[PDB]
Design a protein around this motif. Structure first.
Motif, PDB file in Angstrom:
ATOM      1  N   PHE A 137     -30.978   6.569  36.128  1.00 39.62           N
ATOM      2  CA  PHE A 137     -32.236   6.753  35.410  1.00 39.62           C
ATOM      3  C   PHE A 137     -33.158   7.739  36.121  1.00 39.62           C
ATOM      4  CE2 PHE A 137     -36.506   5.628  33.950  1.00 39.62           C
ATOM      5  CZ  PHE A 137     -36.313   5.788  32.585  1.00 39.62           C
ATOM      6  N   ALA A 138     -33.269   7.649  37.449  1.00 39.57           N
ATOM      7  CA  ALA A 138     -34.154   8.559  38.171  1.00 39.57           C
ATOM      8  C   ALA A 138     -33.807  10.009  37.882  1.00 39.57           C
ATOM      9  CB  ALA A 138     -34.081   8.302  39.682  1.00 39.57           C
ATOM     10  N   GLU A 139     -32.520  10.344  37.915  1.00 37.90           N
ATOM     11  CA  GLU A 139     -32.171  11.740  37.706  1.00 37.90           C
ATOM     12  C   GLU A 139     -32.302  12.132  36.241  1.00 37.90           C
ATOM     13  OE1 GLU A 139     -30.464   9.580  39.672  1.00 37.90           O
ATOM     14  OE2 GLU A 139     -31.414  10.419  41.480  1.00 37.90           O
ATOM     15  N   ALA A 140     -31.980  11.226  35.314  1.00 33.18           N
ATOM     16  CA  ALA A 140     -32.175  11.534  33.895  1.00 33.18           C
ATOM     17  C   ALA A 140     -33.653  11.717  33.565  1.00 33.18           C
ATOM     18  CB  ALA A 140     -31.573  10.422  33.031  1.00 33.18           C
ATOM     19  N   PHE A 141     -34.509  10.859  34.129  1.00 30.62           N
ATOM     20  CA  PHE A 141     -35.947  11.025  33.964  1.00 30.62           C
ATOM     21  C   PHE A 141     -36.391  12.399  34.446  1.00 30.62           C
ATOM     22  CE2 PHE A 141     -40.257  10.744  35.697  1.00 30.62           C
ATOM     23  CZ  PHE A 141     -40.964  10.345  34.565  1.00 30.62           C
ATOM     24  N   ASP A 142     -35.926  12.812  35.624  1.00 32.05           N
ATOM     25  CA  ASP A 142     -36.375  14.106  36.129  1.00 32.05           C
ATOM     26  C   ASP A 142     -35.851  15.244  35.265  1.00 32.05           C
ATOM     27  OD1 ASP A 142     -37.940  13.069  38.127  1.00 32.05           O
ATOM     28  OD2 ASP A 142     -36.307  13.021  39.593  1.00 32.05           O
ATOM     29  N   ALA A 143     -34.606  15.142  34.793  1.00 34.42           N
ATOM     30  CA  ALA A 143     -34.072  16.185  33.923  1.00 34.42           C
ATOM     31  C   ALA A 143     -34.840  16.252  32.609  1.00 34.42           C
ATOM     32  CB  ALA A 143     -32.587  15.935  33.663  1.00 34.42           C
ATOM     33  N   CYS A 144     -35.168  15.096  32.043  1.00 42.68           N
ATOM     34  CA  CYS A 144     -35.816  15.077  30.745  1.00 42.68           C
ATOM     35  C   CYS A 144     -37.262  15.543  30.820  1.00 42.68           C
ATOM     36  CB  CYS A 144     -35.745  13.664  30.150  1.00 42.68           C
ATOM     37  SG  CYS A 144     -34.081  13.203  29.598  1.00 42.68           S
ATOM     38  N   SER A 145     -37.898  15.428  31.986  1.00 40.14           N
ATOM     39  CA  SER A 145     -39.328  15.696  32.106  1.00 40.14           C
ATOM     40  C   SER A 145     -39.677  17.172  32.033  1.00 40.14           C
ATOM     41  CB  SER A 145     -39.863  15.130  33.418  1.00 40.14           C
ATOM     42  OG  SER A 145     -39.591  13.749  33.517  1.00 40.14           O
ATOM     43  N   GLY A 146     -38.705  18.063  32.149  1.00 41.07           N
ATOM     44  CA  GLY A 146     -39.013  19.479  32.105  1.00 41.07           C
ATOM     45  C   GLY A 146     -38.946  20.062  30.707  1.00 41.07           C
ATOM     46  N   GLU A 147     -38.098  21.074  30.539  1.00 41.68           N
ATOM     47  CA  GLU A 147     -37.948  21.710  29.233  1.00 41.68           C
ATOM     48  C   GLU A 147     -37.524  20.762  28.115  1.00 41.68           C
ATOM     49  OE1 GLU A 147     -38.922  24.546  28.283  1.00 41.68           O
ATOM     50  OE2 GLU A 147     -39.615  25.093  30.302  1.00 41.68           O
ATOM     51  N   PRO A 148     -36.609  19.796  28.317  1.00 42.85           N
ATOM     52  CA  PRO A 148     -36.259  18.901  27.195  1.00 42.85           C
ATOM     53  C   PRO A 148     -37.453  18.169  26.618  1.00 42.85           C
ATOM     54  CG  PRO A 148     -34.632  18.697  28.934  1.00 42.85           C
ATOM     55  CD  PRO A 148     -35.734  19.568  29.482  1.00 42.85           C
ATOM     56  N   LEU A 149     -38.366  17.687  27.468  1.00 40.46           N
ATOM     57  CA  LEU A 149     -39.577  17.062  26.951  1.00 40.46           C
ATOM     58  C   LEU A 149     -40.403  18.051  26.148  1.00 40.46           C
ATOM     59  CD1 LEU A 149     -41.322  14.521  26.862  1.00 40.46           C
ATOM     60  CD2 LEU A 149     -42.563  15.447  28.836  1.00 40.46           C
ATOM     61  N   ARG A 150     -40.546  19.277  26.653  1.00 44.97           N
ATOM     62  CA  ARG A 150     -41.321  20.274  25.932  1.00 44.97           C
ATOM     63  C   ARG A 150     -40.695  20.585  24.583  1.00 44.97           C
ATOM     64  NH1 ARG A 150     -46.115  20.334  26.992  1.00 44.97           N
ATOM     65  NH2 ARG A 150     -46.510  20.394  24.755  1.00 44.97           N
ATOM     66  N   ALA A 151     -39.368  20.740  24.542  1.00 42.37           N
ATOM     67  CA  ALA A 151     -38.698  20.992  23.271  1.00 42.37           C
ATOM     68  C   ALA A 151     -38.827  19.797  22.337  1.00 42.37           C
ATOM     69  CB  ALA A 151     -37.224  21.329  23.503  1.00 42.37           C
ATOM     70  N   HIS A 152     -38.815  18.586  22.898  1.00 40.25           N
ATOM     71  CA  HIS A 152     -38.933  17.380  22.088  1.00 40.25           C
ATOM     72  C   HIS A 152     -40.304  17.291  21.430  1.00 40.25           C
ATOM     73  CE1 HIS A 152     -38.057  13.331  20.749  1.00 40.25           C
ATOM     74  NE2 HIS A 152     -39.215  12.934  21.249  1.00 40.25           N
ATOM     75  N   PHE A 153     -41.364  17.522  22.210  1.00 43.80           N
ATOM     76  CA  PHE A 153     -42.718  17.541  21.661  1.00 43.80           C
ATOM     77  C   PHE A 153     -42.842  18.563  20.544  1.00 43.80           C
ATOM     78  CE2 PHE A 153     -44.791  16.016  25.857  1.00 43.80           C
ATOM     79  CZ  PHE A 153     -44.674  14.694  25.455  1.00 43.80           C
ATOM     80  N   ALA A 154     -42.288  19.760  20.748  1.00 44.12           N
ATOM     81  CA  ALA A 154     -42.408  20.799  19.731  1.00 44.12           C
ATOM     82  C   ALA A 154     -41.755  20.353  18.432  1.00 44.12           C
ATOM     83  CB  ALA A 154     -41.785  22.100  20.232  1.00 44.12           C
ATOM     84  N   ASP A 155     -40.530  19.837  18.520  1.00 47.45           N
ATOM     85  CA  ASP A 155     -39.856  19.289  17.348  1.00 47.45           C
ATOM     86  C   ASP A 155     -40.703  18.224  16.664  1.00 47.45           C
ATOM     87  OD1 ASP A 155     -36.253  19.412  17.929  1.00 47.45           O
ATOM     88  OD2 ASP A 155     -37.829  20.927  18.222  1.00 47.45           O
ATOM     89  N   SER A 156     -41.154  17.231  17.434  1.00 44.92           N
ATOM     90  CA  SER A 156     -41.962  16.153  16.879  1.00 44.92           C
ATOM     91  C   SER A 156     -43.214  16.690  16.203  1.00 44.92           C
ATOM     92  CB  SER A 156     -42.350  15.174  17.978  1.00 44.92           C
ATOM     93  OG  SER A 156     -41.201  14.637  18.602  1.00 44.92           O
ATOM     94  N   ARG A 157     -43.875  17.663  16.833  1.00 52.34           N
ATOM     95  CA  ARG A 157     -45.123  18.141  16.254  1.00 52.34           C
ATOM     96  C   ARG A 157     -44.891  18.954  14.980  1.00 52.34           C
ATOM     97  NH1 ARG A 157     -47.133  19.588  22.257  1.00 52.34           N
ATOM     98  NH2 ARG A 157     -48.042  17.547  22.817  1.00 52.34           N
ATOM     99  N   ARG A 158     -43.782  19.685  14.881  1.00 53.06           N
ATOM    100  CA  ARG A 158     -43.541  20.414  13.637  1.00 53.06           C
ATOM    101  C   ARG A 158     -43.107  19.472  12.529  1.00 53.06           C
ATOM    102  NH1 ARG A 158     -39.780  24.034  17.257  1.00 53.06           N
ATOM    103  NH2 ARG A 158     -41.162  25.845  17.621  1.00 53.06           N
ATOM    104  N   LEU A 159     -42.334  18.438  12.873  1.00 50.63           N
ATOM    105  CA  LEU A 159     -42.010  17.411  11.887  1.00 50.63           C
ATOM    106  C   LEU A 159     -43.286  16.787  11.344  1.00 50.63           C
ATOM    107  CD1 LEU A 159     -40.277  15.650  10.234  1.00 50.63           C
ATOM    108  CD2 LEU A 159     -39.918  14.171  12.229  1.00 50.63           C
ATOM    109  N   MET A 160     -44.153  16.331  12.249  1.00 47.37           N
ATOM    110  CA  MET A 160     -45.451  15.791  11.861  1.00 47.37           C
ATOM    111  C   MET A 160     -46.237  16.792  11.019  1.00 47.37           C
ATOM    112  SD  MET A 160     -48.332  14.353  14.489  1.00 47.37           S
ATOM    113  CE  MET A 160     -46.993  14.686  15.630  1.00 47.37           C
TER     114      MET A 160
END
Length: 205
Positions: A137-160
């Protein structure tokens, strides 16, 4: 059929809707997808925005709020309301174990019941370890916190954006390439009604 859930970990009404997410996860043949919108991406000072909401949320949904949240976290100057770390923790739990929804609920509990600091990496790692994800989990959290989180927010916000949704929680049911926003307010506090509504939509399809 896919149920799309637009949420934010720090949204009190999303916590009010936590029983609806749980009941949707029990509907055989329904897929549930989480979309974190990045609502707060505010240091505690912030309290006037939330606490009157919270007791109203409690009286409409029955959702519980802990003394360590009311008189602990909300009184902690050094508490930071940042949606990004807890959303990355949801993404990591989903990536690592398909436990995104369970992690969101656990995170909301840590915040609203236990008064914990869900913007903090050790707190989130401890929640992941409580759910049996301590190996990776620690390493997945760190991986997800960078660009994947940013891409996820962008997707979510355009869907919204495409749904005209003003905010969270927003639920949208997808059927045969169609998207319909559901009347979440009609179901707040009525998770059994909500489960049956989703079952009834499956039957009508």
């Amino acid at each position: 059929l896919t149920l799309h859930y637009l949420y934010d970990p720090l949204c009190g009404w999303c916590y009010g809707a936590s029983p609806l997410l749980a009941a949707a996860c029990e509907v055989t043949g329904l897929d549930v997808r989480l979309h974190g919108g990045g609502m707060m991406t505010q240091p505690v000072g912030l309290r006037h925005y939330v606490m009157p909401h919270d007791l109203r949320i409690a009286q409409l949904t029955g959702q519980p709020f802990g003394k360590d949240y009311f008189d602990g976290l909300l009184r902690d100057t050094s508490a930071v309301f940042d949606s990004a770390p807890p959303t990355a923790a949801v993404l990591a739990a989903e990536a690592l174990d398909g436990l995104g929804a369970a992690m969101l609920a656990r995170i909301q509990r840590a915040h609203y019941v236990e008064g914990r600091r869900i913007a903090e990496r050790p707190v989130l790692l401890e929640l992941g370890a409580e759910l049996g994800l301590g190996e990776g989990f620690a390493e997945a959290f760190d991986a997800c916190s960078g660009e994947p989180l940013r891409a996820h927010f962008a997707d979510s916000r355009r869907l919204m954006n495409r749904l005209g949704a003003a905010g969270f929680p927003t639920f949208a049911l997808e059927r045969d390439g169609r998207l319909q926003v559901l009347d979440t307010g009609r179901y707040l506090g009525q998770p059994d009604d909500w489960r049956a509504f989703l079952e009834t939509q499956l039957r009508l399809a």
